[PDB]
Amino acid sequence: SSSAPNVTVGQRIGTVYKGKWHGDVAVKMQLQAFKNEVGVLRKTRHVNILLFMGYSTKPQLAIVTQWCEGSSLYHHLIDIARQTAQGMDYLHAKSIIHRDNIFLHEDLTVKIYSFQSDVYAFGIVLYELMTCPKAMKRLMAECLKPLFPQILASIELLARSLHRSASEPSL
Amino acid sequence: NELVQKAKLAEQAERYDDMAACMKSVTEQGAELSNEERNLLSVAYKNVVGARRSSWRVVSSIEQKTEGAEKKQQMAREYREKIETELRDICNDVLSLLEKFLIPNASQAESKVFYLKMKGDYYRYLAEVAAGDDKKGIVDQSQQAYQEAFEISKKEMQPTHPIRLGLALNFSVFYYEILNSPEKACSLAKTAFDEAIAELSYKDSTLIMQLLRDNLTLW
Amino acid sequence: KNELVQKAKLAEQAERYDDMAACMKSVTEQGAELSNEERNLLSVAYKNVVGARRSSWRVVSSIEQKTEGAEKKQQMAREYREKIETELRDICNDVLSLLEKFLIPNASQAESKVFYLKMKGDYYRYLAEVAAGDDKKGIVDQSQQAYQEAFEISKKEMQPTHPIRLGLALNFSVFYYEILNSPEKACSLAKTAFDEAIAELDESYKDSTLIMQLLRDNLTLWTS
Numbered sequence: 001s002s003s004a005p006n007v008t009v010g011q012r013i014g015t016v017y018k019g020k021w022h023g024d025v026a027v028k029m030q031l032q033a034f035k036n037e038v039g040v041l042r043k044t045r046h047v048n049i050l051l052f053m054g055y056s057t058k059p060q061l062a063i064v065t066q067w068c069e070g071s072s073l074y075h076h077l078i079d080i081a082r083q084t085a086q087g088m089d090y091l092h093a094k095s096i097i098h099r100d101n102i103f104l105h106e107d108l109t110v111k112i113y114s115f116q117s118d119v120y121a122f123g124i125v126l127y128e129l130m131t132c133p134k135a136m137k138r139l140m141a142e143c144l145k146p147l148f149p150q151i152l153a154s155i156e157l158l159a160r161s162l163h164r165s166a167s168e169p170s171l
Numbered sequence: 172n173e174l175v176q177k178a179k180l181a182e183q184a185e186r187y188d189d190m191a192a193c194m195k196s197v198t199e200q201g202a203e204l205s206n207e208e209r210n211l212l213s214v215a216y217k218n219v220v221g222a223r224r225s226s227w228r229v230v231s232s233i234e235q236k237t238e239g240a241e242k243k244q245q246m247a248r249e250y251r252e253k254i255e256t257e258l259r260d261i262c263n264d265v266l267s268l269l270e271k272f273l274i275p276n277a278s279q280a281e282s283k284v285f286y287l288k289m290k291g292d293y294y295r296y297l298a299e300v301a302a303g304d305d306k307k308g309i310v311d312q313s314q315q316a317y318q319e320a321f322e323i324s325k326k327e328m329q330p331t332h333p334i335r336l337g338l339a340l341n342f343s344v345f346y347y348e349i350l351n352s353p354e355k356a357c358s359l360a361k362t363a364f365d366e367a368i369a370e371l372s373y374k375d376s377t378l379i380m381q382l383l384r385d386n387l388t389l390w
Numbered sequence: 391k392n393e394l395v396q397k398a399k400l401a402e403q404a405e406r407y408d409d410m411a412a413c414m415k416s417v418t419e420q421g422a423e424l425s426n427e428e429r430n431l432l433s434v435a436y437k438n439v440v441g442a443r444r445s446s447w448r449v450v451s452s453i454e455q456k457t458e459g460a461e462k463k464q465q466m467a468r469e470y471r472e473k474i475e476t477e478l479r480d481i482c483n484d485v486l487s488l489l490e491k492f493l494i495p496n497a498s499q500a501e502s503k504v505f506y507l508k509m510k511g512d513y514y515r516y517l518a519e520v521a522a523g524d525d526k527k528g529i530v531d532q533s534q535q536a537y538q539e540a541f542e543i544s545k546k547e548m549q550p551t552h553p554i555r556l557g558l559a560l561n562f563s564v565f566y567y568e569i570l571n572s573p574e575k576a577c578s579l580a581k582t583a584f585d586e587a588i589a590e591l592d593e594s595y596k597d598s599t600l601i602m603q604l605l606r607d608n609l610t611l612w613t614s
């Protein structure tokens with residue numbers, strides 16, 4: 001019990017919309033351009049990032065993708081900023097050039113011409129998130145004014161931060 | 172307002188005995204606890220009974236599962252009564268201040284409702300603690316305690332005021348558990364959940380309506 | 391005899407330890423040798439009865455600092471801290487009295503001697519964290535001495551990856567940085583202690599890991 005206190009296609013957004021194919025999903029509802037962006041976007045897979053859950057062609061061509069529930073980049077620190085750099089870095093490594101989005105799943109896993117073009121915009125996104133170590137600011141400035149594997153190493157150096165001590169556990 | 176500040180402080184440290192103990196004093200003055208001192212005495216004694224009721228629910232469980240051992244069950248029972256005695260001792264300490272100091276000084280409808288509901292719960296805890304004929308007398312004391320509150324607040328307070336739901340939530344919890352009569356339990360909550368929805372503080376109200384909702388799907 | 395252990399367990403399932411500690415010290419007065427897990431009962435029984443008072447002391451003191459912009463509240467907040475201080479001091483002096491009187495003197499086994507001596511050094515440290523005047527200084531040495539005696543005994547006979555020795559070096563280190571403010575000596579002890587275990591690290595490995603992660607996480611805290 002408990003006493004008083006103390007003290008299928010579903011929802012739509014856009015084209016984009018929600019879905020229900022084998023569970024709640026997102027449906028990415030011109031046609032030639034839509035297919036082209038589908039082909040480039042559909043490449044991402046085989047990672048913890050940029051995951052899909054289905055596809056559609058008719059009666060309305062669309063892409064079914066896995067859902068996400070969390071404090072997205074705009075919807076909402078370093079724990080994800082590593083993920084974003086890694087995911088874009090890994091996709092860049094596989095030779096997908098984006099030159100262009102970040103949504104939190106479980107509130108912990110943030111899900112997302114040349115590589116540097118994506119670097120330029122990522123520096124701006126990182127800057128807004130941070131506005132703290134000075135290394136974070138220096139990395140963002142360098143990107144706006146390096147190789148993504150170098151940016152990932154830059155985050156590693158930014159991982160120096162890790163109050164109060166902690167004794168043997170009370171058991 | 173030294174006692175309240177000390178109690179505010181004993182809450183921050185999580186020393187709940189001192190919470191109530193210095194809160195008893197301002198009640199003993201014959202004053203009408205404000206909307207804050209009401210809550211401070213409320214959390215003060217709630218945590219003191221939550222602990223013993225939480226210990227009792229453990230020791231009682233052990234006493235059931237100790238069918239094997241013979242002397243071991245003796246100690247397990249011996250300790251249980253030690254908690255119940257600690258549980259009862261705090262309860263009598265709260266009801267007494269209730270009847271002597273709070274309800275007599277009560278003037279507002281929320282004041283009377285709060286203190287009788289407080290009287291109602293502190294007889295429902297005693298009911299579970301009670302074993303036999305005491306259960307009958309104490310539960311009979313329990314039913315009267317809540318009922319006075321319920322008939323006060325059926326008309327002397329707005330349909331959405333939190334205590335009206337707080338009276339609805341626990342009065343019903345007394346209905347199902349102690350009386351073993353879910354029918355009255357769901358009837359009270361459903362009426363209570365219904366009249367608020369029609370009348371639909373808001374953030375406060377929805378905090379407990381979920382418990383009103385869960386009770387309805389519980390019994 | 392065996393009944394007291396049963397009641398202490400019955401007080402660590404009800405999560406009421408003031409009786410668990412009270413029953414355990416009663417077993418201590420017997421003067422016999424606490425068994426492998428009867429000793430552990432005493433540690434957790436007393437480890438929780440103290441931890442409750444320390445954190446209660448922590449917030450109250452923190453309020454005293456935050457409430458520097460007043461008089462009556464600070465007087466009462468200071469007064470309430472002195473109440474948590476005194477309660478804690480009593481519990482400290484109770485455990486130590488058992489250790490030096492009954493447990494340490496009969497600590498025949500090496501593992502037991504390091505366990506108690508570390509525990510004696512440990513429960514001395516709790517006394518130091520609250521003690522301010524020269525009492526802190528007196529407590530600082532006795533924490534140091536007892537920490538050290540266990541520290542030496544552990545090296546002589548005990549393995550370098552045992553949970554106690556690791557917990558001893560994790561605790562001793564916390565004394566260095568917190569009570570003494572010598573992070574150089576803290577990290578040297580913490581770093582050396584877990585470094586040695588890693589060399590010989592290879593159920594037995596799991597427990598050492600939980601302390602070791604505590605050891606290493608402590609280090610990263612102190613470095614920066």
Ligand SMILES: Nc1ncnc2c1ncn2[C@@H]1O[C@H](COP(=O)(O)OP(=O)(O)OP(O)(O)=S)[C@@H](O)[C@H]1O
Nearest residue numbers: 013014016025026027065066067068069072101103
């Ligand atoms: N798989 C998904 N899980 C959860 N939310 C999603 C998912 N796919 C899309 N959304 C939401 O739907 C919104 C639709 O907007 P977006 O597709 O991100 O951008 P857009 O509105 O199409 O405009 P642009 O210019 O193309 S970025 C997103 O901002 C998310 O909030």
